[PDB]
Design a binder for this molecule. Sequence first.
Ligand SMILES: Nc1ncnc2c1ncn2[C@@H]1O[C@H](COP(=O)(O)OP(=O)(O)OP(=O)(O)O)[C@@H](O)[C@H]1O
Ligand SMILES: Nc1ncnc2c1ncn2[C@@H]1O[C@H](COP(=O)(O)OP(=O)(O)OP(=O)(O)O)[C@@H](O)[C@H]1O
Ligand SMILES: Nc1ncnc2c1ncn2[C@@H]1O[C@H](COP(=O)(O)OP(=O)(O)OP(=O)(O)O)[C@@H](O)[C@H]1O
Ligand SMILES: [Mg+2]
Ligand SMILES: [Mg+2]
Ligand SMILES: [Mg+2]
Lengths: 476, 471, 470
Amino acid sequence: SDVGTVIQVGDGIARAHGLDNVMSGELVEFANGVMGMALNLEENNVGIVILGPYTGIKEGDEVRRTGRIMEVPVGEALIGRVVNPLGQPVDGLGPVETTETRPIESRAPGVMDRRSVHEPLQTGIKAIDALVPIGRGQRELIIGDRQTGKTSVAIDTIINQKDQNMISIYVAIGQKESTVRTVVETLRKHGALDYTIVVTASASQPAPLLFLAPYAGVAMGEYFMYKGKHVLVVYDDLSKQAAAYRELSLLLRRPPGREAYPGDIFYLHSRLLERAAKLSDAKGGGSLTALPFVETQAGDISAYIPTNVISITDGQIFLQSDLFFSGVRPAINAGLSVSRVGGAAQIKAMKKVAGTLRLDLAAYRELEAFAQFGSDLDKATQAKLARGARTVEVLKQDLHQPIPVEKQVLIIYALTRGFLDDIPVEDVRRFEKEFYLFLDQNGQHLLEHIRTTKDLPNEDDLNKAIEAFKKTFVVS
Amino acid sequence: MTRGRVIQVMGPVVDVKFENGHLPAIYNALKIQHKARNENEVDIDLTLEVALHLGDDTVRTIAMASTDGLIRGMEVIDTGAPISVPVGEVTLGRVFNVLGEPIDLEGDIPADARRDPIHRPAPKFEELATEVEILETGIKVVDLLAPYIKGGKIGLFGGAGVGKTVLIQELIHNIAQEHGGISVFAGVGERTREGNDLYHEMKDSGVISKTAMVFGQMNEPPGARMRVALTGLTMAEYFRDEQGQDVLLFIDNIFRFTQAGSEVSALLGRMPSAVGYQPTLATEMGQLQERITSTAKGSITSIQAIYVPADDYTDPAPATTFSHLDATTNLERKLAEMGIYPAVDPLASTSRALAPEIVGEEHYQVARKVQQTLQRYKELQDIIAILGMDELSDEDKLVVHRARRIQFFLSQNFHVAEQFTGQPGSYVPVKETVRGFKEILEGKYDHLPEDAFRLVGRIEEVVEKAKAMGV
Amino acid sequence: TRGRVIQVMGPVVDVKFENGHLPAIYNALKIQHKARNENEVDIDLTLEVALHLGDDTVRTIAMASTDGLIRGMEVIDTGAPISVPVGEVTLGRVFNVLGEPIDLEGDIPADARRDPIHRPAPKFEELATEVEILETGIKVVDLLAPYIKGGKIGLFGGAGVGKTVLIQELIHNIAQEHGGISVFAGVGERTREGNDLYHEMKDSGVISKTAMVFGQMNEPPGARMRVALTGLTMAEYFRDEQGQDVLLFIDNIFRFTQAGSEVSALLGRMPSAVGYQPTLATEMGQLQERITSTAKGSITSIQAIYVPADDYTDPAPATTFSHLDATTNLERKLAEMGIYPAVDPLASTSRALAPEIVGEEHYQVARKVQQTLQRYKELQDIIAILGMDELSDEDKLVVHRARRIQFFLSQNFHVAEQFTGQPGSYVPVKETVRGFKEILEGKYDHLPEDAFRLVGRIEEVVEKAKAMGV
Ligand SMILES: Nc1ncnc2c1ncn2[C@@H]1O[C@H](COP(=O)(O)OP(=O)(O)OP(=O)(O)O)[C@@H](O)[C@H]1O
Ligand SMILES: Nc1ncnc2c1ncn2[C@@H]1O[C@H](COP(=O)(O)OP(=O)(O)OP(=O)(O)O)[C@@H](O)[C@H]1O
Ligand SMILES: Nc1ncnc2c1ncn2[C@@H]1O[C@H](COP(=O)(O)OP(=O)(O)OP(=O)(O)O)[C@@H](O)[C@H]1O
Ligand SMILES: [Mg+2]
Ligand SMILES: [Mg+2]
Ligand SMILES: [Mg+2]
């Protein structure tokens, strides 16, 4: 029949005898009210992973099958609410009021069902928008050592995307709920909770629910992507999902691989992350973009999980510790940071302004190393080092101060065309803000042309305005 | 029959058989008491915790007391609940073990006192509350570059022989004996010599009247060493919830918790993982540390010591616990080999509080700049070795000149270091620290010799020291 | 004849054929079920036999996800391996692992010729060899490790080094020149790059000269295993029965072996090496041997290989290294430095760097370049310890010219217009040799080192130096 008796219980796994007609992936329910997923079927005993606190489960307990595959409730009511990976409210405030349930075992958008990523996305950060542009539908990785700026950049991005309608989802995997509370409160404070959903997986909750969390997040997002919305999903630590699956595999007695992870690590993350796409015009035009994160010990790019996830994503933003403590924030290493959809995601004015900046910054870095070993350099090398030093200042930015795309191109054009020649490196940051104010109060028409056209204006008036501002600006 | 027989014994682990229909739960406590009928047989005083239900009426358990002398056919008793440690106000000024029994040789807690379980789920999302407020302990480095957070976790990371316990004791002194508030102390995996020295130091300081203690020690079987911290936590929980009183919870060398879990899992039959660690490293850790939080009803501040197994900081246990903390001080060894105590890494140490609007604009403005100058010193050493005077020039030379002065000033004389030199310690307040570092950065005192800046408390003392030495 | 499913553990299933007949290894089985009630899920599945068990039982690797499978399901035996539609019909179309087409443009009827994917390799008598250079227009490959027509080409690298940029550049130039049938099989790729490449091909019109088989990351391991064999099977017909010269492209071959390792533990194989299956080299050689040029036809095969942790000494890259005739190894340091592509000049090799193939002057120039680069490679460790003012005149000149050289190995690319916004260039071999001869002799010492970065021809170097104002 549809029921069976549990025969073993421990650490979240429970073999059962019976359950003759059970299907693979089917949800089952215990008398404790705790749900379970029937992952493996042997000849005479099912292997059940427990989706709740296992303390209440005993041998000889009956288990019943629901008759359906693993399903996550979805809808518009979830916006602004906090929920488990399962459809259970965590903030109280009554039920989640969801519309319908999407099976989370669905296939990805197939070949030729997509389109080239061309829709821009603005983080509000000069360095990221200028050097590593992101487009909608793209999957880009932000990676680095702990305490460097992962969640600061994710939250800055979510907050800056306030106008352009974008159903956003923020998945917390294996988190400390004080940080979940602080993130929720920052979203509410800056007025961004009204268009976000938060799914919570925390260490007190059993290990299987950490593995299900990003799957549930993407399954929630893909409802809005199928109906035609632009969507965003954030995974602030995929590394903790890897560990959860490593736990789940070993408890089922399965051999390891490199490091200690099993071989299915690539399959799991690829199965997850392939569901992000920019659907074709025949499908509706939705654009789900994912922003996963992984933490690398000692800031090491060359490891099993880091390179595993790097091979599945369309770009790298590398956060480096000694740059962070040197005062360069946000700390991004030009060399190891690049995007594989670059060029399309930038508006044409930005491309005309700066398209060689990243390569020239990596050249500045390697030349700084060569100067570190040597004593002194020739005149043109001095000039190159001088300009490369200035490029770093123009990309410094303070926390929680977003900038629109139009303002960036002014300062980047000033930098690339050599207008920061007479300004010492100490005064560059002051120059930036004074230039912002001067263009806001004197040179509005150029910014108007940029805003309406989406292209660079006639440079004569721009050059005259910059010269006039250089007349206004006082040097220390 | 409610009672159950013992089928197998293997080290700490014991396998009990219960009649069908009367099996215990996962975290039940079981008791064994034996009447010896033969000269060969021995007296038994044993209680055990369930771990797994391994099917066919059999249950696998973990030893809390040593299993030597066990026999097959003995009768186990099911308490139907966990250890149920007695708790209340009765436990103030007493020393216990993991089972809830005192070891201070004073008396027996009455049989009608209320007792509560050790295992229970953590505070929910709605019940937590968040604020950042400084706790001032007077240690220059930790109060300038990484101030503590009331209601938050603090971690002391270091190897063997660095000073973690010296820091613990110094914090107990400076904070508890000059701020007040209920304290609980759990010695975990420590030399039992220090379980006596702390007792006597607190009594001769006169502070035991408002603290409780639990000790498990290395000697005990692996299960007790891990359950001890949870007993300390279940003690503090009653203070914070039912009495509504804030708690300061001290735990020493928390690594022994993971190490004992690893050993117990190896006994249990779980497959290995990582560097011999159990599969459930972060699940079993997170279940513990998620309960140490500040709800709206009351708060727990915890100061903990994390021992790094070797030179490798990237060991799974130090790495996984780093995700749970709020402020951390990492203890250097090369500074300790230079005698610059306390050997705290001024660049690896972190705190959630160091922000221009959480700890003060001026404090942050000086702190981040000093950290920048330290990072500048770190990278710039090579040019000095390779070429010396005519490459260490101009601004780098001046940076080195002031950085050498400011490097030693992070050192301070300690109260618990009176054994090592003949002079007492000093508690240095925040304002003085912030002003003193600034006065160094001005060059106001850079003509003083660099060695003077060691093991003093206020910037005027450095002029006094330079006059006393005549250098 | 039918068999009952009795076990299922992820990718692997365990059918029992109790009728008195059993399938052979590599055969294909079918599951087609109609849901009897609202709880059951309708399923259409195929399984390939991988191992024979004891009692009327076989271990079968599933080709698609196994959800909904119930013990006691009935399995049909097709009696033959996986069949692939073979002919001129494959040109233009895109297919999946089982042989069905992926684009919506149509269907393939029953009358089409279909061939099994598993068969023995060519014998020793059939092979043939030649030395003819295949010009690429890429300075590094052309001057330091020339490719050869009909020779296996290997691109080795870890994640994010420049492998697929090189694949696209080579496919653009070669498909511009060669009148060859082309087969493109993507194993374990990003499913977005497949669509992007399809649209680029449609812009180029090469789609009529190309046949494509696609299986990517989102697929269970069995399809990832068999996709490269399907693409090879098509290239086989084109090479032999038509007698037409063919090109076979495969990007990141590794996932063929990775998928085999993942299901290996489920198949009862004891572990080996770094988690790999015991049968690694047998399977890798079995695949690689079938890709050969015979007298009947020739296959120019260009392959890209991925390293699990970027350690070239990893078992899988090490086994593959023996099957190549030219290899370019790309490693992250050059990518960090800004020089592109990331090919290592002193570890990329080909069977064609010999005066009897490339001529005396070319060989001398290449070897002298490599000598200068090795001298600087040791001088970096010397200079770190002693400083840069303790070296003598000649030791300083070595550093100067090595710096001038490794920049000139960087080239403005065609497909890198999106990434850097530059036109692109095609550099003839003679011009590369002339420029490098000018460099080694010190004819361009006065130019600053920045002038040599990301340019096609030495004339563009002089133009960029003129732009710098020198
Ligand atoms: N523009 C900026 N200017 C200055 N500081 C910044 C800026 N952006 C981010 N930061 C700093 O970066 C840090 C971000 O910490 P956060 O908690 O977001 O990190 P995380 O990597 O997500 O988490 P964890 O370290 O807990 O794993 C903070 O110290 C914040 O002050
Ligand atoms: N403030 C100090 N001033 C001078 N020397 C000190 C100071 N603190 C510690 N030391 C020296 O370093 C040693 C530190 O010993 P301690 O037991 O505190 O280190 P530990 O290995 O971190 O501790 P444990 O392993 O017991 O947790 C002392 O024995 C003493 O020699
Ligand atoms: N010639 C070049 N000029 C400039 N940038 C380049 C060049 N070649 C590659 N890049 C940059 O490096 C990135 C490398 O991406 P690519 O698809 O080539 O990776 P890969 O080596 O195939 O890696 P993976 O195995 O992870 O797919 C490109 O997206 C681009 O940003
Ligand atoms: Mg974080
Ligand atoms: Mg100690
Ligand atoms: Mg690829």
